[PDB]
């Protein structure tokens, strides 16, 4: 006879339990990365703001030199 | 020749809104393991045209109980307000060079809620009233945080001008010294534009459509284009604020390419965000922004007040 039957060795194991990976860095790592990015941005903004102040002083002194003719 | 500049500013952003609807449906299908609209045109390129013509050949269907004045006044004011704050954006040269463009953006953003309130009150229904109340609560939540975010980010810029904002990017992005404020600003832009998980007005499961539940086609499309112009422009503003690019006065093509790509990527990120999270309750909106956001941004505001004095890095006002 022929009928719907599982095979001679049966069917294989089937996973039925939860599997969460558990991934990412430790919280100290992202805190250190954020703090380092903050410090780098602070340093770059400091340098560029000082340069901008120097350029503004230069432009203002050019204006002061140009004033009497106007 | 300001008319040509105004027209070329205001028409392609409407086309961008239409193709934003196209790519919205396409991508929103694509993370849901399905295709998007691709039957009407080649890869669905004719979907926005069919959507636009279809809404404008329907019946307007004004309600009898609705006060017709604010009912007809709300969508035009919404579309104008979503259109009228595009001007101070440097692109790389803005349309109108206002010294206080940030204040103009803030005031016209405060005005944008009034269309929602007038559409909620003009139509005589309970759902529109609940949507108007939730919009009021959303404004209560987002305004007192957004103003301080913009001030504290702007404190290193030196002035309220958006043209000088492109100068500060010449060395490093301001997202590096203000990444927490970048997170606060992104959540605030999520909250203001009424996009999920901060929608709370055009709810599908809570209400039917909320503030425009009684709004049939024609007047309804104006709110759609106003919201989508709002989100595109808000992402452009966030790109200019935090990820400003390299500007060369001899070739504006580089900066146009760069900020277009960055704003497009940020809008794709917005689309990615809007359909992965459950909708927030509006009682938890000011149980979060008035509770968790406000003390943190007060601390960061006083930190950014006291920081240029600390490092001797006072920016120039000119």
Description:
This is part of a larger assembly, with chains A (70 residues) and B (318 residues). Chain A has 70 residues and is an all-alpha fold. Chain A has one helix at 27-66. The longest helix of chain A is centred in the middle third of the chain and has 40 residues, at 27-66. Chain B is mostly helical and 318 residues long. Chain B has one domain. Helices cover 61% and strands 0% of the residues of chain B. Chain B has eleven helices and no strands. The longest helix of chain B has 29 residues, at 2-30. Chain B starts with a helix and ends in a 7-residue tail after the last helix. Classes of the chains: A mainly alpha (70), B mainly alpha (318). Chain A binds chain B through residues 34, 37-38, 40-42, 44-50, 52-53, 55-56, 59, and chain B through 156, 158, 167-168, 170-180, 307-308, 311-316, 318.
Distance between the amino and carboxyl termini of chain A: 113 Å
Continuous helix count of chain A: 1
Helicity level of chain B: 55-70%
What structural class is derived from the secondary structure elements of chain B?
mainly alpha
Overall number of structural domains of chain B: 1
Envelope shape of chain B: globular
Radius of gyration from the alpha-carbon trace of chain B, in angstroms: 20 Å
Please count the helical segments of chain B.
Answer: 11
Distance between the termini of chain B: 29 Å
Shape of chain A: rod-shaped
Subunit organisation of the chains = part of a larger assembly
Instruction: Give the radius of gyration of chain A.
Output: 35 Å
Biggest beta sheet summary of chain B: none
Order of helices and strands of chain B: HHHHHHHHHHH
Question: What share of residues of chain A is helical?
Answer: 55-70%
Strand residues, percent of chain B: under 5%
Q: H/E order of the elements of chain A?
A: H
Q: Count the strands of chain A?
A: 0
Largest interface: A-B, 18 and 24 residues
What's the main sheet of chain A like?
none
SSE-based structural type of chain A? mainly alpha
EC number (chain B): 7.1.1.2
Protein name (chain B): NADH-ubiquinone oxidoreductase chain 1
Family (chain B): Belongs to the complex I subunit 1 family.
Subcellular location (chain B): Mitochondrion inner membrane
């Amino acid at each position: 006879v022929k009928q719907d039957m599982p095979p001679v060795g049966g069917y294989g194991p089937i996973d039925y339990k939860r599997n969460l990976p558990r991934r990412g860095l430790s919280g100290y790592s992202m805190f250190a990365v954020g703090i380092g990015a903050l410090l780098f941005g602070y340093w770059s903004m400091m340098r560029w703001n000082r340069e901008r102040r120097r350029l503004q002083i230069e432009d203002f002194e050019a204006r002061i030199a140009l004033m009497p003719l106007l | 020749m300001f008319m040509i500049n105004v027209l070329t500013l205001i028409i392609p952003i409407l086309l961008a809104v239409a193709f934003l609807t196209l790519v919205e449906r396409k991508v929103l299908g694509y993370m849901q393991f399905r295709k998007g609209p691709n039957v009407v045109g080649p890869y669905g390129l004719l979907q926005p045209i069919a959507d636009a013509i279809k809404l404008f050949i329907k019946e307007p269907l004004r309600p009898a109980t609705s006060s017709i004045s604010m009912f007809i006044l709300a969508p035009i004011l919404a579309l104008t307000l979503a259109l009228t704050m595009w001007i101070p954006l440097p692109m790389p040269y803005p349309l109108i060079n206002m010294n206080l463009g940030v204040l103009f953006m803030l005031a016209m953003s405060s005005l944008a809620v009034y269309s929602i309130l007038w559409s909620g009150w003009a139509s005589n229904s309970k759902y529109a009233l609940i949507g108007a109340l939730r919009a009021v609560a959303q404004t209560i939540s987002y305004e007192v945080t957004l103003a301080i975010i913009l001030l504290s980010v702007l404190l290193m810029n030196g002035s309220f001008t958006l043209s000088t904002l492109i100068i500060t990017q010449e060395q490093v992005w301001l997202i590096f010294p203000a990444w927490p404020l970048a997170m606060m600003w992104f959540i605030s832009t999520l909250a203001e534009t009424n996009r999920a998980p901060f929608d709370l007005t055009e709810g599908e499961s809570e209400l039917v459509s909320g503030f425009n539940v009684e709004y049939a086609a024609g007047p309804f499309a104006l709110f759609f284009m106003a919201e989508y112009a709002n989100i595109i422009m808000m992402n452009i503003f966030t790109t200019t604020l935090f990820l400003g690019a390299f500007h060369n006065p001899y070739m504006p093509e580089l900066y146009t390419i760069n900020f277009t790509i960055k704003s497009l990527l940020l809008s794709i990120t917005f689309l990615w965000i809007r359909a992965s999270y459950p909708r927030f309750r509006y009682d938890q909106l000011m149980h979060l922004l008035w509770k968790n956001f406000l003390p943190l941004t007060l601390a960061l505001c006083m930190w950014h007040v006291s920081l240029p004095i600390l490092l001797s890095s006072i920016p120039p006002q000119t």
